Amino acid sequence: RIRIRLKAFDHRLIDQATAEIVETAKRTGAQVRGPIPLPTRKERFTVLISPHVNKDARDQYEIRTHLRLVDIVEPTEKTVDALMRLDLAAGVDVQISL
Amino acid sequence: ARIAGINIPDHKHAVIALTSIYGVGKTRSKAILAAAGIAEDVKISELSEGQIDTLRDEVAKFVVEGDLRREISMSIKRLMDLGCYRGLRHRRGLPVRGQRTKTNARTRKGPRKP
Amino acid sequence: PRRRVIGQRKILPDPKFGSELLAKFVNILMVDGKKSTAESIVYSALETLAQRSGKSELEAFEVALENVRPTVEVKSRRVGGSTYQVPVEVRPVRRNALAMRWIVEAARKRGDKSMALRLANELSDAAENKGTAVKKREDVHRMAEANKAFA
Amino acid sequence: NQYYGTGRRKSSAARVFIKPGNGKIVINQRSLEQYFGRETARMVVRQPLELVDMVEKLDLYITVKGGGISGQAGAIRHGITRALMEYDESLRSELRKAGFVTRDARQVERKKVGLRKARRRPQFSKR
Amino acid sequence: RSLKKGPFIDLHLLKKVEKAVESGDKKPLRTWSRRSTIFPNMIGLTIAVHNGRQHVPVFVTDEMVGHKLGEFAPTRTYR
Amino acid sequence: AKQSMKAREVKRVALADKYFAKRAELKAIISDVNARWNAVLKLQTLPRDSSPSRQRNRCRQTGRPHGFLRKFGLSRIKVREAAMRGEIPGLKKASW
RNA sequence: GGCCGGGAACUCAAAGGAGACUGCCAGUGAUAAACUGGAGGAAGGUGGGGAUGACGUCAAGUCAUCAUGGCCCUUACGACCAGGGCUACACACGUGCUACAAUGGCGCAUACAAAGAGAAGCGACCUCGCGAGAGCAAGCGGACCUCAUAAAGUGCGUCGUAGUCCGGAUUGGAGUCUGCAACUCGACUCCAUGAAGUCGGAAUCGCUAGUAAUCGUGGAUCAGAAUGCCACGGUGAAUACGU
């Protein structure tokens, strides 16, 4: 319906983007349950630090994938207007699907 | 209790008794007793002579003892006579499947000497 | 252990009998960190001990272990370019610690069937002494008294 | 109203409930003897109920997941102590001495680079 | 043992085998490919297996059909 | 990093769409228990360098044939050189 | 059957906060720093672990990832292709796995995890085969669906001290899979064979608590080959008098 799901890399990026979408929706419309935090998948990589030998020292790498789910419960024609194209995208992949 | 092949076990299970003969192991051991209709946990003691020859007939089907030794030794000798990779590898006393001879050939090769 | 002195952390007691002495005992026998298989041997050994001897449960192994308590032990010096063994009185914490070890180590050298049985055999011969632990308890005893000089 | 307590022990999280009724143990819709707790850590679930006047005092419903046999048992151990809030923090004063309200900070150590599992440095050749 | 259904061979050597039947056998054929298995039609014919120096004159026989061409030429020189 | 073997990659990768991919639909349903005719396996005289797993997957910048990661598409050295200069979003010092 | 209303508590989940500072108290200490103990608290004396590695040393390693001074070859020390080698075998050492077993082997029944990966992918369920897998074929770009039925443990039975139901090597016959391609030179399965080995010489390696030890799982690499490597959890000790 309005089943939204995004993904951001930094510990706090979406928190302001998924904040502004709430008061855009709940002010003009109604309901709007709010941003569900969801589990963060963290893809951990480990590779050899030196070009030759030196396996005993390695630098560990990680990429955190932070999810959010808004889910506006009120699909009014007033609230769907003046909401889209206020995303001001900082990279984050917006997706609207079941 | 001659039991077809020259091996004669006693005072043990029927599953153990079978595996002691050459050319028979744990899988066939269960199959021969299951085919003949014998229990796993019953011993050679309390087993009639008319119950022996039924299991004797089952082991008599598959090639066992000296007949399997010559059959395997045919496939060793014949394969050596080909002059193949495996054939030269048998006669020279070295690993046939392609194991590493760099280190740990000690099973097929044999003990270290000067 | 040069600067830092530990607080000697206390293990929990035995879940059946409640004895904190047996909590260390099961842990000596425990190999591969298996407490469940360790105690199963311990109880099966202790049940066969008190049944055969006809004594009570707690004081069977305690009076048994009291016979295998070492009086004194020695410590290697290495000071003036030579090995000097100096005898010292083992304290009650270390006294039963070596006792439980040498019972389990003596039962480990046996060629008997089960661990419950072979351990119980050494517990059975603890009160009247023919076994290997009761030989092992006074090994340094002969080396001691000869080293009474160094004190 | 129900008398709730959480508790946990090495990634094993329990959810304890207490009431005034009968002393039948119910864990994950299963009995205490049918909760397989026969060997050491048999009665660590009732370790916080060792030194109390009980006979058959309270209903108890508990539910633990995560970790293993002993970790789930210590989650029930620490969980029941939080559920003692029916008697507020008056009975805690004696329970502080026992150290059951004390939550275990000991967690399994991470695997480290050039180490077999968290500590063991793999042996080196001679000198 | 391996290769599932059907014995795998190379195309160029299959033509060489059919050449030895149709046009008739003459000399040992020098082949670089060791991938192709021996067949019943190859019995009687002469081939030569390369292995890092020169093609070794290997003769085909009845029971050699089961094994590969490269088995009969050891690559690594010893002694 | 030896521009010839890097140029050999450009050949090897570019052949994968012509000879295989589209025409490698042959051998998939064809070499299967059906109905046999052995003329299908005689189509394997193709140049071979199009093979689906023939590339080593060298690093996109340098061309090292070792320490390649499928995620970043680069070698561990060029991962670290880049990683310390940022460039991978969400990448930092891993500790937990 | 949390499965369907519902319920938002709870666990779980990820955002922002509080909470641990020798401060409250006691003693010692030049009355300072600090130390020892106590109280409170989930956590007390840099809480636990990681990240975090000064000025410099060893002309230490890396001209082979890359970059680059100089030198050298340039119808060749370049370039392309096929096959071969890197996997050799009278030897020596290191680093590991698997054992020598009744704290155990085998067979049946049964309970309890965490961290991941997955669209040129992971594969239910279903049918076929003893099996490796094959054909048919949902859902899920993923707290949903798939890999995934974790093992120690535990309940019975059997084995009862032997080169054995220990142990699995080697070898034979016969299969599957990935791929143009499995002989050199594979993984894995089936049947059969069942070397050595029964705690190992001088000496030598690590570890102070959720550690040693032991028992499983996942990933990266990758078409396909882990006992390695990286990551995760289960159960879980011994002993620290002292320098």
Swiss-Prot record, chain A:
Ribonucleoprotein keyword on record: yes
Q: Which GO terms describe its biological process?
A: cytoplasmic translation; regulation of DNA-templated transcription elongation; ribosome biogenesis; transcription antitermination
Entry superkingdom: Bacteria
Asked if the keyword Cytoplasm belongs to this entry, the reply reads no
Q: Which UniProt keywords apply?
A: Ribonucleoprotein, Ribosomal protein, Ribosome biogenesis, RNA-binding, Transcription, Transcription antitermination, Transcription regulation
Q: Which cysteines are joined by disulfide bonds?
A: none
UniProt-listed Pfam families: Ribosomal_S10 (PF00338)
Q: Name one GO cellular component term.
A: cytoplasm
- Which GO molecular function annotation, any one, does this entry have? structural constituent of ribosome
State the similarity comment.
Belongs to the universal ribosomal protein uS10 family.
Q: Which HAMAP family match?
A: Ribosomal_uS10
Task: Say what the protein does.
Answer: Involved in the binding of tRNA to the ribosomes. Part of the processive rRNA transcription and antitermination complex (rrnTAC). The complex forms an RNA-chaperone ring around the RNA exit tunnel of RNA polymerase (RNAP). It supports rapid transcription and antitermination of rRNA operons, cotranscriptional rRNA folding, and annealing of distal rRNA regions to allow correct ribosome biogenesis. In complex with NusB is involved in the regulation of ribosomal RNA (rRNA) biosynthesis by transcriptional antitermination.
Q: What is this protein called?
A: Small ribosomal subunit protein uS10
Task: Look up and give the organism this protein is from.
Answer: Escherichia coli (strain K12)
Curated annotation (Swiss-Prot), chain C:
Source species of the chain: Escherichia coli (strain K12)
Q: Which UniProt keywords apply?
A: Ribonucleoprotein, Ribosomal protein, RNA-binding, rRNA-binding, tRNA-binding
Subunit details for this protein? Part of the 30S ribosomal subunit. Contacts proteins S9 and S11. Cross-links to IF3 and the P and E site tRNAs.
* Biological process per Gene Ontology, one example term: ribosomal small subunit assembly
UniProt family annotation: Belongs to the universal ribosomal protein uS7 family.
Signal peptide range in chain numbering: none
Q: Miscellaneous notes for this chain?
A: The strain K12 sequence is shown. Has been predicted to contact the N-terminal domain of IF-3 based on footprint studies; exactly how IF-3 interacts with the 30S subunit is controversial.
From the UniProt record, list the coiled-coil ranges.
none
**What GO cellular component entries does it have?**
cytoplasm; cytosol; cytosolic small ribosomal subunit; membrane; ribosome
GO molecular function ontology, one term from the record:
rRNA binding
**What is the protein's known function?**
One of the primary rRNA binding proteins, it binds directly to 16S rRNA where it nucleates assembly of the head domain of the 30S subunit. Is located at the subunit interface close to the decoding center, where it has been shown to contact mRNA. Has been shown to contact tRNA in both the P and E sites; it probably blocks exit of the E site tRNA.
This protein's name: Small ribosomal subunit protein uS7
Swiss-Prot record, chain D:
Pfam families reported for this sequence? Ribosomal_S9
Q: Which UniProt keywords apply?
A: Ribonucleoprotein, Ribosomal protein, RNA-binding, tRNA-binding
Q: Which GO terms describe its molecular function?
A: RNA binding; structural constituent of ribosome; tRNA binding
| Recorded superkingdom | Bacteria
Q: Which GO terms describe its cellular component?
A: cytoplasm; cytosol; cytosolic small ribosomal subunit
For whether the record's keyword set contains Ribonucleoprotein, the answer is: yes
| One GO process term, biological-process aspect | cytoplasmic translation
**What's the stated role of this polypeptide?**
The C-terminal tail plays a role in the affinity of the 30S P site for different tRNAs. Mutations that decrease this affinity are suppressed in the 70S ribosome.
Q: Which PANTHER family match?
A: RIBOSOMAL PROTEIN S9, SMALL RIBOSOMAL SUBUNIT PROTEIN US9M
UniProt subunit comment = Part of the 30S ribosomal subunit. Contacts 16S rRNA. Cross-links to the P site tRNA and weakly to the A site tRNA.
**So what family is this one in?**
Belongs to the universal ribosomal protein uS9 family.
Tell me what this protein is called: Small ribosomal subunit protein uS9
Give the organism the record lists. Escherichia coli (strain K12)
Q: What is the lineage of its organism?
A: Bacteria, Pseudomonadati, Pseudomonadota, Gammaproteobacteria, Enterobacterales
UniProtKB/Swiss-Prot annotation, chain F:
PANTHER family linked: 30S RIBOSOMAL PROTEIN S14, SMALL RIBOSOMAL SUBUNIT PROTEIN US14M
Q: Which gene encodes it?
A: rpsN
Give the matching SUPFAM superfamilies.
Glucocorticoid receptor-like (DNA-binding domain) (SSF57716)
How does this chain assemble?
A: Part of the 30S ribosomal subunit. Contacts proteins S3 and S10.
The record's family statement is: Belongs to the universal ribosomal protein uS14 family.
Q: Name one GO molecular function term.
A: structural constituent of ribosome
Q: Key word Ribonucleoprotein present in the record?
A: yes
Q: What does this protein do?
A: Binds 16S rRNA, required for the assembly of 30S particles and may also be responsible for determining the conformation of the 16S rRNA at the A site.
Lineage top rank: taxon: Bacteria
**Swiss-Prot/TrEMBL GO biological process terms:** cytoplasmic translation; ribosomal small subunit assembly; translation
Q: What is this protein called?
A: Small ribosomal subunit protein uS14
Q: Which UniProt keywords apply?
A: Ribonucleoprotein, Ribosomal protein
InterPro entries in alphabetical order: Ribosomal_uS14, Ribosomal_uS14_bac/plastid, Ribosomal_uS14_CS
| Alphabetical list of HAMAP family matching this protein | Ribosomal_uS14_1
Q: Which GO terms describe its cellular component?
A: cytoplasm; cytosolic small ribosomal subunit; small ribosomal subunit
